[PDB]
Symmetry: D2
Subunit: 295 residues, 4 copies
């Protein structure tokens, strides 16, 4: 009976991308054909998480709620909470403490895109763990802006350093973390860092010192994209666009995932699609009931 509680952290001071983020939050902006936040929401749904808390800024949380609602249209439970100030990833587990309660949980960042073959099998393995924590390591060209994993010769994780001056490897900790029921108390016990933030690296290092942290390599066959620059936002959009145009399939379509997980039935999906029948996205939903696709 594993009902993991998912958190999407979708706040952030939001100034690197000025002026496109001046009055619209980054995680509501389009990545090709759908808002950014559809992708990490979909990642949680593909992991099996059906209870999702969306955290954003005081000003933008009504905007996320106007877009996703309570999630019942997708047979899910989506709730909202605000982060007054962007004081660190680990504050998600203080703001989301009541939502998490006594259950296992997962945190994903609202601007992180995960894509690749067998991603579901890897997320389901992380979701099924009853103890400890699971994070993922991914080779990037700029590891120094992330938590960086030091690996021994067999890729067992030895340490995690947040934004090291000399990174021990190129493997960054991705923005997706699975935890057991210790994390809320761990997050409440840690102190702000020199840069003034409650550090997810400190949470992860606590599990590491207990020898209960699983650090899974996300291989180069996966795309783990964040979108920190105007250029990389375009690059994520064209990357998504090339795949969808080639396949005739949509990445991170929550209606599709909900239907495939039996969270909604064929009548409900048709009901979502009928008012969207005049656009391409509604046509894809309509065609899910006829097009044989391996899932």
């Amino acid at each position: 009976h594993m009902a993991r509680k998912g958190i999407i952290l979708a706040g952030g001071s939001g100034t690197r991308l000025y002026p496109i983020t001046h009055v619209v939050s980054k995680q509501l902006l389009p990545v090709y054909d759908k808002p950014m936040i559809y992708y990490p929401l979909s990642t949680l749904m593909v992991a099996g998480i059906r209870d999702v808390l969306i955290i954003s800024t005081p000003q933008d949380t009504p905007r996320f709620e106007a877009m996703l609602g309570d999630g019942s249209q997708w047979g899910m439970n989506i709730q909202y909470a605000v982060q007054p100030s962007p004081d660190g990833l680990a504050q998600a587990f203080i703001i989301g403490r009541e939502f998490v309660g006594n259950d296992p949980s997962a945190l994903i960042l609202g601007d992180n895109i995960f894509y690749g073959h067998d991603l579901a099998k890897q997320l389901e393995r992380a979701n099924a763990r009853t103890d400890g924590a699971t994070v993922f390591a991914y080779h990037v060209h700029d590891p120094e802006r992330y938590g960086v994993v030091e690996f021994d010769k067999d890729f067992r994780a030895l340490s995690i350093e947040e934004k090291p001056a000399k990174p021990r490897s190129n493997y960054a900790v991705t923005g997706l973390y699975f935890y057991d029921n210790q994390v809320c108390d761990i997050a409440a016990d840690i102190k702000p860092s020199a840069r003034g933030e409650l550090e997810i690296t400190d949470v992860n290092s606590r599990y590491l010192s207990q020898k209960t942290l699983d650090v899974e390599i996300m291989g180069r066959g996966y795309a783990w994209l964040d979108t920190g620059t105007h250029d990389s936002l375009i690059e994520a959009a064209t990357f998504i666009a090339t795949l969808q145009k080639r396949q005739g399939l949509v990445v991170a379509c929550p209606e599709e995932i909900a239907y495939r997980r039996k969270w909604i039935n064929a009548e409900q999906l048709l009901a979502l699609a009928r008012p969207l029948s005049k656009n391409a996205y509604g046509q894809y939903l309509q065609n899910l009931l006829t097009d044989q696709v391996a899932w």
Copy 2:
């Protein structure tokens, strides 16, 4: 003393791009490094128009106002009005009738990008006309979704047909129109078309029958981009991005145009830039005071 009144029509039912436009209006979405509406706002400013009325939907007009304010930060006058229902381009001159008053005017669409050499000279020539109307004709591959100009052998405009089944040419009327003080009364006199809209083509055909319509060809050396599909939105963004990265210059930067037109002075521009000093856009503003550029 030519103080032309500019209107940006930035409403629209907004469903072709679902779901990216579900809770954010299309004209607030990014085209590379800045919101879409910066481009037609800039076009008006490059034409010399300093008084701008922004029309959008009831729901999104506060959003445009939160982003542009009253324009005094750029030494301009920007006002707002709502379109309850998207009943046609020519309704802009009913909603904006009081704003226009007894002055000449210009209408530009909130999702139209205009770019090219000597665009300013062409817009200033259209702006300086004391009588009649000036519209622009542009060769597109899909003229049939636009007002289409029929030309004689010397490219004198003979007729304009809105969305013809068999287009007489490939020249579409762009989404930028200059009018004398007849347009508000002309717009109030016309009747909705079979498709239920107050047609700008009917306004333009009225000037045409008076022999006071100037139809100027916008040559293929210009980019006139609207962004009707997910694909063409990306294509406009990468197009802008290639030029700006090559030149080290920004397209449709309103601060720059305001400074160059002496609507704001060096102290004011520095003041806009100082709180933006941590991002690339603020660095470009800061560098306008030192970088010698022909304008």
Copy 3:
């Protein structure tokens, strides 16, 4: 020891004029020539003996590019196809090359990318009999061989460019065969469109109940480059991944080194004359960059 064939011949004039005097598979996909990608796919499958088939005009160009493969601890040979008379003709041109060994054919303009691709190719390479092809959901299946699947995705038929495709699953341009294929290819007759059809070869294995049709899931990119637009899209796709990762897709030097077909001294030697460009710097950094494999 499976023998690989890369079919890199005449693609027609659809892309005119970019292919007017340069064969398509010599043209860049972002940062390296197109044929590097299917070459790398064969190497990832473990195939070390490769026959490159091209037009007579461009065989010295492919040979000038890849050499005999000994620089990567491989064996690369060349053969010509005077006229592009069908995929299955590769097994006539390469009959001597294949001999009595198993083989694989890949198209010189097909890109394959995704997680665990190696595990799937090694499983196909390790089969002792029959054939393996892969099925991939595309929006325009009718320009390919199309797989008809039952409810359990068992393959029932393969039709070359059907008017009404029975599914959206196209047969990708990568095929593994046992020692029957050369004799089969020699036995089939030109089709209505005048070509020796890989679909007829594959349909033979299916009717013999020795064809494995494996789904290549949507987590994979299977890209060909049949239009000017899709050539661009393949280039920007690769570019997004390499810029993000700091890693290069389809770097044959890297693959040979990781498979121990060449050692560090040989890799440094390949790198030194390239030290002034980014590609040679990437090879040099392979000796220090810890990458999981």
Copy 4:
């Protein structure tokens, strides 16, 4: 009758391996080979006599592509550059070709696009003495000749790749010259970097007070393609414009027809063997598509 030179020789190995066996200026920019663009720029200037300079290895490839130009009512000849020893060497290799006429040099990998470009090139082509070059604001001027401008944008100096560039204006890769240039190029000596410098030729005209330095404004695209990324960016830029307009950039057949260098019967004849691809269909539609010129 001004004589045009396209310098399309050796660019080094920065783009390795995409240029390893194919010269860069034969490679595609979206839908046509790179050299089509500077070729078209010369034709838009009115230049009808073109010398293509390339490496010895690729001169048959350029010639296989463009022919003698008589198919477009032009005169196209070929010459080789054994070693890439400087832009100004084009006027030594092409000394016989230029003779006593005026000339223009354009780089085989430079793209020029924008409104009224023709009016500007025709004004340069119509000058009776001196030289004309163009200055363009770029983010990395230090990799070019850089123009020093006074407050009125009168040119004061040109420095080749200065450490501290005096402005952001680079000299673009398109130059118009009177009959002095060949003798000047024969007179200059290799520079510190070992090249015969176009900046030394241009600085000679400036000191003689016969150099016109014209700003090419930001409304123009002046694109070279020195990196893998910028080659992609040039391709997607062209693609965005052609898809929007239904028009093709740098179509030599179109330019020759509009300038009446070939007539409709000759254009139909060029089109007929290409009727099965989009390029030949575009030529055919030129006879019906009313386009302002």
